[PDB]
Symmetry: C2
Subunit: 178 residues, 2 copies
């Protein structure tokens, strides 16, 4: 709807121990390792639907969560799974790296008007990329603004920055209604 | 090719006088004003191909130029056109606001690898937008990185930042080459 909805949360954790990727893939019910295709073990859990990328270094990336809470729960679940597989991993330094979200203002935007009114903040070159790219400074967020009125907000580390960025941009969007 | 080529330069200038947009469009050989379509006069010159957006406020935006030099020359030409039309405009505070450029590294990139290695700097969600968006801090540039190996750099105010950004990213790109 009009309030940004979290579409993806990406987190990292350090397992604090080197893992044998081939062996995790062999023993785990839902994990694969194909180094020519991706240089990490790819492990997935059902509900909620998330994906863990488990690197040889011990670093783990968790993606696919729809909230900070779900992200933390997921990371804990993968840790548990890895421990039950018999590796000596620990849960260390969980951190949210990125939050992507979206909303829909339900009217069309004249992107050309917005771009030339704020050219030091955004780029619009439909020959090269669809939609208008707006680099907000306070807070540090990149917004993708589409003619349809769909808005994507990227680069947030906490949810409050997403809402604040959308509060900042909204009065600008209404000025360029199509 | 491999070194970024400037694709667009956007600049602004303050004319220092409120202009009658309807009258500029009437008198100018190649300018139009349709306030329901765009809230500015759109004026265009042939060679080199550029566009001026002339606002009632007196502010002018010049777009379409391929270099800083060509942008300033275009601005000068539009000013001189406006002056010959009988308006009292002056050339105040020309400023480059944005430079967009592109290059091609001529290999494919595994965008998933790049995104999960550097998730605090970039976003990749092909369901929502094509290509990977990388927010560089030093210098302040946003790069769009595509599977094809095409790279777009946006947000630069001087061309040196474009080259520096690309020099910064290139060693990361090579780490994620794909067949």
């Amino acid at each position: 709807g009009i309030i940004p909805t979290l579409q993806n949360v990406v987190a990292t954790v350090n397992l604090s121990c080197k893992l044998d990727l081939k062996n995790i893939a062999l023993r785990a019910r839902n994990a694969e390792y194909n180094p020519k295709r991706f240089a990490a073990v790819i492990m997935r859990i059902r509900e909620p639907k998330t994906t863990a990328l488990i690197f040889a270094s011990g670093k783990m990336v968790i993606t696919g969560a729809k909230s900070e809470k779900s992200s933390r729960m997921a990371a804990q679940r993968y840790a548990k799974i890895i421990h039950k597989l018999g590796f000596n991993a620990t849960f260390d330094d969980f951190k949210i790296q990125n939050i992507v979200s979206s909303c829909d203002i339900k009217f069309s935007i004249r992107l050309e008007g917005l771009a030339y009114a704020h050219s030091n903040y955004c780029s619009y070159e439909p020959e090269l990329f669809p939609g208008l790219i707006y680099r907000m400074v306070k807070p540090k967020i990149v917004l993708l603004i589409f003619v349809s009125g769909k808005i994507v907000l990227t680069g947030a580390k906490v949810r409050d920055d997403i809402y604040q960025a959308f509060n900042n941009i909204y009065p600008v969007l209404i000025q360029h209604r199509k």
